[PDB]
């Protein structure tokens, strides 16, 4: 089965294992789910933001209107569960949705999605930044002193996208301002990206919170700025972050576990997305093979009744309670493998 076909199977697998009993819920958070009521209490607004993105990946691959519709329907379901707006207490949850909104805008051409993305950017600029810890956007409204990567890196990406779209200087200025702070405060000399700082109001960094998605979004931020500025530092930094990530976060061809919590299940999917952008920008065949080889391990072990149930550890057979966040990273990885399989040419 080709990668494009595995991506299609992955797309179908989500509802196979997560379709909820009611249309209102849409998807159960876990599989299996012995007690739906309790397991579904948490509204994973940010998980759904990434589902919109993976549904869009399928559309970009197929060009089928039906696929774009599933993406839009998903986005509206999420926005409406959140009260008919993208505004949320967690600045990062908002950003993931703003990124999905922009991609939806580019695919549908509907102005409401661009306005949604712009509104999120504006809300962060108007309320999320302060000079505690020297700058940076805060994690959530009730904790304005805690500055972390999940908020700052995605904001840089959103700012760059908005800059290219609207051509207003404020977008590039904020992208640069945020990048400078992010790099100075949360990035290691060798390119490793720390999760955040001052979470406990003690001014320290969570060094042991080594997560793949922090590396991924920093790579994306660098590539977006490289596209706009063309300064070597951005491409060089993207490469260093990618290299250190593979060196310290992987083992035996796959990424090591990052935690049994639900949210962590989505982390490596996010890395794969921006890591794939680096691959296309640099034509790095070693990194290209890492993606394809890791996906091979996933498919050789995630089979379940003809479909794919993809947990946190890609080498192990599907076991225990699995959040669809993990399912999403598997789906993202396969869509990336499928894209790589098309051998798109970007540079000679």
């Amino acid at each position: 089965m080709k990668w494009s076909e595995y991506a299609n199977l992955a797309q179908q697998s989500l509802e196979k294992f997560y379709l909820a009993d009611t249309k209102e819920q849409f998807l159960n958070n876990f599989y299996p789910t012995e007690n739906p009521e309790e397991d579904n209490k948490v509204f994973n607004y940010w998980w759904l933001a990434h589902l919109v993105e993976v549904r869009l990946d399928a559309y970009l691959r197929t060009k089928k209107q039906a696929d774009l519709e599933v993406a839009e329907k998903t986005y509206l379901h999420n926005k409406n569960r959140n009260g008919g707006t993208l505004i949320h207490d967690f600045y990062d949850d908002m950003l993931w949705n703003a990124l999905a909104a922009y991609r939806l805008y580019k695919a549908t051409g509907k102005s409401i999605y661009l306005e949604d993305a712009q509104l999120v950017w504006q809300d962060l600029v108007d309320t999320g930044w302060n000079d505690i810890m020297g700058g940076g956007f805060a994690w959530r409204r009730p904790q304005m002193y805690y500055k972390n990567t999940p908020v700052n890196a995605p904001f840089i990406i959103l700012s760059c996208w908005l800059y290219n779209e609207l051509n207003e200087t404020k977008y590039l200025e904020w992208a640069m301002k945020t990048y400078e702070w992010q790099t100075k405060v949360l990035v290691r000399e060798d390119g490793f990206v720390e999760d955040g700082i001052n979470r406990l109001e003690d001014g320290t960094i969570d060094y042991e919170w080594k997560f793949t998605y922090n590396q991924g979004v920093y790579i994306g931020a660098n590539l977006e700025l490289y596209r706009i500025t063309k300064e070597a530092i951005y491409l060089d930094t993207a490469n260093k972050t990618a290299a250190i990530s593979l060196k310290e976060l992987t083992e035996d061809g796959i990424f090591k576990d990052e935690g049994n919590g639900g949210d962590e299940g989505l982390f490596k999917g996010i890395f794969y997305r921006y890591f794939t952008d680096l691959i296309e920008e640099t034509a790095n065949k070693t990194y290209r093979d890492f993606v394809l080889n890791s996906c091979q391990i996933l498919v050789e072990n995630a089979k379940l009744d003809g479909y794919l149930l993809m947990g946190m550890n890609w080498k192990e057979k599907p076991s225990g309670k699995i959040p669809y966040s993990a399912e999403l990273s598997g789906m993202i990885a396969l869509e990336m493998a499928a894209k790589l399989e098309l051998e798109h040419h970007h540079h000679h």
Side-chain angles (χ1 to χ4, degrees), residues 1-33 35-188 190-259 261-348:
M1 201 183 264
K2 311 197 72 64
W3 289 126
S4 56
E5 304 176 322
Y6 270 121
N8 178 56
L9 178 62
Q11 290 292 329
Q12 304 178 310
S13 300
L14 218 209
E15 295 199 331
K16 182 66 179 176
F17 298 109
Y18 297 92
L19 192 64
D21 289 337
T22 65
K23 55 191 185 301
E24 287 68 39
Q25 176 62 42
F26 175 37
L27 301 172
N28 295 317
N29 287 323
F30 303 92
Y31 179 81
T33 185
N35 186 337
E37 193 98 312
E38 195 56 36
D39 293 323
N40 292 340
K41 294 296 184 183
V42 176
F43 164 41
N44 290 124
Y45 171 58
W46 87 281
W47 290 13
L48 287 162
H50 286 89
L51 173 57
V52 172
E53 276 205 273
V54 317
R55 291 307 198 199
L56 288 177
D57 297 329
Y59 170 61
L60 294 181
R61 166 170 55 74
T62 65
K63 312 294 167 34
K64 301 293 181 173
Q65 200 57 76
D67 286 340
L68 173 56
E69 293 311 320
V70 173
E72 273 197 70
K73 187 176 178 179
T74 300
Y75 176 89
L76 292 181
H77 161 83
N78 198 34
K79 183 178 178 180
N80 284 302
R81 273 206 67 183
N82 191 54
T85 176
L86 292 187
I87 302 299
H88 192 271
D89 255 32
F90 290 67
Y91 288 109
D92 51 357
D93 290 12
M94 283 183 72
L95 284 169
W96 297 119
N97 278 283
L99 295 179
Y102 183 80
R103 294 188 59 203
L104 247 190
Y105 167 65
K106 298 295 295 178
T108 66
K110 302 185 187 181
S111 66
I112 186 58
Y113 301 137
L114 172 59
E115 304 191 25
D116 278 337
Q118 201 299 308
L119 170 129
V120 167
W121 182 91
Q122 197 65 62
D123 179 275
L124 270 116
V125 169
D126 297 344
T127 74
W129 182 287
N130 60 58
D131 211 47
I132 294 173
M133 289 307 329
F137 292 99
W139 183 38
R140 59 187 177 116
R141 298 177 205 277
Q143 194 163 19
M144 298 301 295
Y145 55 82
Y146 174 32
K147 316 308 186 68
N148 61 334
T149 298
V151 175
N152 289 277
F155 174 93
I156 298 169
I157 297 177
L158 177 62
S159 293
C160 287
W161 288 0
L162 253 19
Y163 177 63
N164 302 323
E165 181 65 44
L166 304 167
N167 309 109
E168 294 180 53
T169 62
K170 68 176 175 178
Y171 292 121
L172 177 57
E173 300 189 307
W174 269 103
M176 285 301 313
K177 181 178 183 175
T178 306
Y179 182 83
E180 285 301 307
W181 178 87
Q182 173 69 39
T183 302
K184 179 172 66 178
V185 184
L186 299 176
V187 181
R188 221 163 61 183
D190 63 358
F192 190 77
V193 189
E194 308 291 1
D195 190 73
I197 188 169
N198 204 40
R199 173 172 58 85
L200 300 171
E201 303 194 79
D202 60 13
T204 67
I205 296 171
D206 286 303
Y207 298 110
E208 294 308 315
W209 284 15
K210 311 178 201 213
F211 301 129
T212 51
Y213 82 141
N214 289 148
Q215 318 309 313
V217 283
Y218 189 56
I219 286 169
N222 274 283
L223 292 174
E224 290 304 329
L225 284 173
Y226 182 59
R227 175 170 296 98
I228 296 166
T229 74
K230 275 94 130 167
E231 303 288 15
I233 188 64
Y234 299 116
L235 178 59
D236 300 342
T237 298
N239 277 315
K240 293 206 307 179
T241 295
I244 197 64
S245 294
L246 297 176
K247 168 139 172 290
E248 296 184 343
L249 305 180
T250 70
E251 205 159 84
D252 296 319
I254 62 172
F255 277 94
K256 311 181 198 177
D257 293 335
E258 308 179 66
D263 292 332
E264 303 92 285
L266 238 172
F267 293 3
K268 56 179 155 299
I270 298 174
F271 177 87
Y272 273 94
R273 179 181 297 290
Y274 299 109
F275 179 61
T276 294
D277 285 331
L278 181 61
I279 293 175
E280 297 194 290
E281 172 55 35
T282 64
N284 188 313
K285 301 310 171 182
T286 295
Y287 292 173
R288 173 193 165 87
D289 294 338
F290 176 78
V291 174
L292 269 33
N293 293 352
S294 59
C295 283
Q296 183 56 49
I297 293 172
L298 174 64
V299 297
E300 299 179 325
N301 297 292
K303 302 313 299 293
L304 166 31
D305 279 2
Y307 290 82
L308 298 166
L309 180 55
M310 311 164 275
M312 242 273 227
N313 188 309
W314 290 3
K315 174 61 175 179
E316 305 190 312
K317 297 303 188 302
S319 309
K321 204 172 188 60
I322 304 174
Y324 73 81
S325 58
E327 188 74 348
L328 286 169
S329 59
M331 308 176 244
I332 292 168
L334 294 173
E335 287 291 346
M336 294 306 103
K339 183 162 62 180
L340 255 14
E341 183 177 62
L342 291 180
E343 307 177 341
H344 290 140
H345 302 303
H346 300 104
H347 292 101
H348 187 195

